[PDB]
Design a protein around this ligand. Structure first.
Ligand SMILES: N[C@@H](CC(=O)O)C(=O)O
Ligand SMILES: N[C@@H](CC(=O)O)C(=O)O
Lengths: 164, 169, 163, 170
């Protein structure tokens, strides 16, 4: 496979329990736990960007994410991210000429990887393949399919991303 | 019409380490229920995936006749995107055989599995199932092995039993 | 001897809900642990509450006492939040109608449905305690037995400790 | 002085299904590292439990010699509360053997294990470890099997291989 760069921006996928909080915080990146047992053949590296809930991201934050992705010489990019503003980040990156040669896939999980019954590990496998296999562009890989960010919204009534 | 989600992927299960499960009776692992069905239960899929049983043999005990029946089931599917979960010991044999079937020419057919049973701690299974479902949807028509976060050409691949990996010839 | 298990909620039973963007008190985790415990003996589970123990009032503890008093069983396990486990245990230890019973409170500092949880160990340990201890009221946590009158939850330490 | 938590329990490990783990070399389960150590890492214990490896043979491979070596290790512990994790197939034989040693008269010695490996989904292991730790602390001196959420008298217990359960002899 082509070299894959993974950026971690936080989200439910990375949530972990803290006694002090009496609840979940955004913890260490769950993608690193999945890849530790994936027996990878190829070149993959993981970079920490942010440990935020995506609800708390500003236009400034999205701009910083785009410049960070442009710092990678890799042409295949996975960004793990909260689902609540995944569409906004993806649309923002889709507009950056500097990223036009890259395949950039955003993913995450509706249930924390550290909670029972999580979609995280499946989503990570699916999104790593998507980052390696899709043509240049910006995509959301969730629910075992590929979404066009310009034509996607998160439907909270369904608990899924859906096309517009 | 209101939007209908397609179900473009079909999964077949042929057993293998991925599906092993502990049985008191035997004091060890047997080939059990398909682990791929457990991963997809919590994957919050937009579509559905039809999962069909073909076999629960060890991939070491496959004959001509077993490989031929897998070819018919895959050939008869309406879907053009197919994942076959399978033992790793003879995954190359099965993949090479399916490569020779003109009836599969318009289909993307991916074989995958796991070096560690899904029901054992520290398993590659869930990652490999996500990666392989993506590969089955995104690769051009052909027959592939998706393992170790990469895609292998069956004609140019062997299983290294001692090293626990697929590798190039 | 027959064991009766009451569930009053707590961290042990927390589960994720998409609606909440976080944890809520979910179904009792003790039922998931006992499902695979291959039990030989008579055990039954009753739902009492799904609160964070922080929201428990005197009336809440009173309802819990009457429910335990409805059980003919002499071996009782109560799963519960850790934050007011001492208050509930002290209240039950004052009820003459429960004097013949061994009543053990337990729970977990990490939710059973979160990785790295003490829940399953705590449930095994507490079920043994409920069956093996003399009549009384006890907290079983950290692999030992606490006397409620002489115990506090030290949030700085993250453990129950003697006073 | 400031309060010191005692460590009144010692754990010995003799193998068994509880400790099984998958090995690619073998294309199956072997007796791996002691699973009790994994349970106690996340148990938030007040004390500290010393865990001592005695054996990794399958319980069916135990000799008289092996049982004797286990009795000498248990007898030499200073702790009066002892848990021995073990295979279920010959747990009764090891338990009966220990029950005959005068050296163990003042100790509460509990044998436990699991019908399903701790590293396999749906395992009884973690429950059984919590139960057995409590049993080793709370039971009077003697030798016991703690399985299925109850305490067995080794002299009046058999392993039902078919049902994967310990049962009384009535
Ligand atoms: N509030 C979370 C929701 C999620 O990731 O599913 C986030 O956007 O970070
Ligand atoms: N806040 C929780 C803490 C715990 O159970 O550990 C409760 O009392 O419900």
């Amino acid at each position: 496979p082509s070299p894959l760069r993974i950026f971690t921006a936080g989200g439910t996928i990375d949530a972990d329990y803290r006694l002090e909080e009496n609840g979940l915080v955004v913890g260490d990146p769950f993608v690193a736990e999945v890849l530790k047992t994936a027996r990878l053949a190829g070149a993959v590296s993981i970079v920490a960007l942010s440990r935020k809930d995506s609800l708390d991201f500003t236009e400034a934050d999205r701009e910083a994410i785009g410049r960070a992705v442009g710092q990678a010489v890799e042409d295949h990019i996975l960004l793990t991210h909260g689902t609540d503003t995944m569409v906004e980040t993806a649309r923002y990156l889709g507009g950056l000429p500097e990223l036009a040669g890259k395949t950039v896939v955003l993913s995450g999980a509706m249930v924390p990887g550290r909670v029972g019954g999580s979609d995280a590990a499946f989503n990570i496998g699916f999104a790593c393949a998507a980052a390696l296999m899709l043509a240049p562009g910006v995509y959301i890989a969730m629910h075992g399919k590929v979404f066009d960010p310009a034509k996607t919204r998160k439907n909270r009534g369904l608990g899924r991303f859906e096309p517009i």
